[PDB]
């Protein structure tokens, strides 16, 4: 068988900053529960 713009650079920079803080909080909460065991 074979098989069968928005031009938003400031929004992109803000996107990336908030995503990075999300990641930092994620691992900051991971180590909180791991390091106590």
């Amino acid at each position: 068988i074979v098989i069968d713009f928005k031009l938003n650079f400031l929004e992109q920079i803000r996107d990336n900053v908030i995503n990075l803080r999300k990641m930092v909080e994620q691992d900051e909460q991971l180590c909180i529960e791991t390091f106590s065991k």
């Binding site: 930092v24 900051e28 180590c31 909180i32 390091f35 106590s36």
Partner: peptide, 15 residues
């Protein structure tokens, strides 16, 4: 402090 460890680690290993 377990959250200061993570900031120190994230600035020492930022690059």
């Amino acid at each position: 402090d377990i959250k200061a460890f993570v900031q120190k680690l994230g600035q020492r290993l930022c690059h």
